[PDB]
Structure 1
Amino acid sequence: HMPYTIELIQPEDGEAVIAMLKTFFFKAEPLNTFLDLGECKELEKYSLKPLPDNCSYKAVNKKGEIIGVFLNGLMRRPSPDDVPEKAADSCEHPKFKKILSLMDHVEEQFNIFDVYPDEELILDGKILSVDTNYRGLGIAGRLTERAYEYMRENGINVYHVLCSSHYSARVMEKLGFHEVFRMQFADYKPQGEVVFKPAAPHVGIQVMAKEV
C-alpha cells in the first residue's frame, strides 16, 4: 500500500526489476509484439545495463514491492572518431537481434549531441514502467522528477529518451519533452526491404528530449 518511497536502484535489485518489467513493460513494446518475442534472456540482460550508472530510480510500496522504475544511463559527448560498440554484435537471439540492429542504426543516423553540441553529459532515459495496479497516480512523474534532481545535482541540462512506441512518445510529451528525431519503420530497409511493420499508430522511432 502507499505512500511509496522513491529510491536508487542497486545492482542487487536486478532480479526484482526484471520480474516487474516482464509483467508490466516488455510485452507492451510494439517491436516485441510485432516480432512475437517470447521469453528473451538477452532482452533482460540488455535492460539491466544502465543500473551501475547510479541514476536509476524505483518506486517501492509499503510491502516492499517495486511498483515503478525509471532506468537511466549517462551519455557522454562522443568524439568524432569514436565508434560505439554495436549492441546487436554477438546477440544470440535472432528476433531480439533485429531490434538491437535497428537501435544501432538509429545511433548511426542521429547523435543527440548534434542537437546539443555544447553539452558534455546528457541523461538517457531507457525504461519507464509503472505497475498496472498503480497507474494514473503520478508515479511516472515523480520518478521523472527524481531524475531532475540528479540532473541539478550534477550539472546536466538535457534529458534524452528514445521511444519505439507512439504512445510512449506521447507520455513523454505530457511530461514536458519534445521530439528531436524520427525514423519511420516504413523507411528502415537495411538490406533493401522493410523489417518492421508494427500496428498503425506506431510509425517509427521517436527520440524525445527535454531541457531542464
Structure 2
Amino acid sequence: SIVLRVARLDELEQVREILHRIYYPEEGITISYVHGKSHTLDDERFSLSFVEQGTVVVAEDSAAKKFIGVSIAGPIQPGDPDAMVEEAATTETKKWGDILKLLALLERTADVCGRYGLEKAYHVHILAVDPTYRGHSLGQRLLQFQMDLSKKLGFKAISGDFTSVFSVKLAEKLGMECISQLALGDYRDEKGEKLFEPLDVHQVIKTCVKLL
C-alpha cells in the first residue's frame, strides 16, 4: 500500500528524482516556455529549499521503496511578490527569472492575505502524481495531507496555483474557491514580451484558496 509522509532532509536526492521524473517534464509553466522546455538548476534549488522546512510531502510505494507522488508548499505573506521580483533580477538563468516574475504576478493578483485578513497563508507550489498510479486517490491524498498539515502548523488558510484541469478539480472538491486566474498565452512581462506558448492554447492557471 501507499504511504504519505513528510520528506526528510536526508532524502533531498529522492525528492530531486521524483521532481525530475513526473513534475518538470509535464508542468505547464516550465514546458510552455518560449526559449526551451527544460527546467534549470535555480528552479530546482527553489523547489528543494522546502525539504528542510518540513513542508515537502511524498507519496511512497514502500513495497518498491520508491516515491510516486510529491507536493511542495511553503508560507506566503505580504511582501513576497516584491522579494521574488528582486530575486528574479539576480538569479542565474533568465528562464527562472521570468518564471519567478510570473509566479510573483500570480501571487500579487490573488492577494490571499489581503482578501482574507491573514498575516500569512500556506501555498502549494507543486502537486504531482505518477500517472501510472491511478485508482488510489493519490492527488486528493497529497492535497488533503497538505491541508491537514498546514492546519496543524497553525496556518489559517491554504492556496495554490493549479495549472491543470485535474488539479483545479481537486482544489474545488476539497473546498477551495478559485479567486483569480491567468491565461498563460496572454501573459506579458514588463517588456511586453510573450514568454509562454502552451501547446494547448487556452491553457489557464487558477489560484485557489480555502480557510482552514
TM-score bucket (shorter structure): 0.7 to 0.9
Letter in 1 for 2:65: G
- Give the Cα separation in 2 of the matches to 1:166 and 1:201: 12
Report what 2:7 is aligned to.
Answer: 9
Distance of aligned partners of 1:139 and 1:113 in 2 relative to their CA distance in 1, 3 Å threshold: same
* CA distances 1:36-94 after superposition (whole Å, capped 9, x unpaired): 3225222211211222322321122122211111111123x437x99424342222223
DSSP-derived class of the 1:176 partner: coil
Report what 1:96 is aligned to.
Answer: 96
- Give the Cα separation in 1 of the matches to 2:39 and 2:151: 38
- Structure 1 spans left out of the alignment, 5+ residues: none
* CA distances 1:4-27 after superposition (whole Å, capped 9, x unpaired): 222211222221112112111111
Distance of aligned partners of 1:187 and 1:154 in 2 relative to their CA distance in 1, 3 Å threshold: same
Report what 2:24 is aligned to.
Answer: 26
For 1:1-212, list aligned pairs within 5 A. Answer: 3-35=1-33, 36-38=36-38, 40-61=40-61, 62-75=63-76, 77-78=77-78, 83-86=82-85, 87-117=87-117, 119-189=118-188, 190-198=190-198, 199-203=200-204, 205-212=205-212
Q: Give the RMSD, CA atoms, in angstroms.
A: 2.5
Judge conservation of contact 1:51–1:73 (CA < 8 Å) in 2: no
- Give the Cα separation in 2 of the matches to 1:83 and 1:202: 26
- Structure 2 spans left out of the alignment, 5+ residues: none
- Give the Cα separation in 2 of the matches to 1:167 and 1:149: 20
- Give the Cα separation in 2 of the matches to 1:177 and 1:99: 24
Distance of aligned partners of 1:59 and 1:185 in 2 relative to their CA distance in 1, 3 Å threshold: closer
- Give the Cα separation in 1 of the matches to 2:207 and 2:107: 11
Percent identical residues = 23
Letter in 2 for 1:47: S
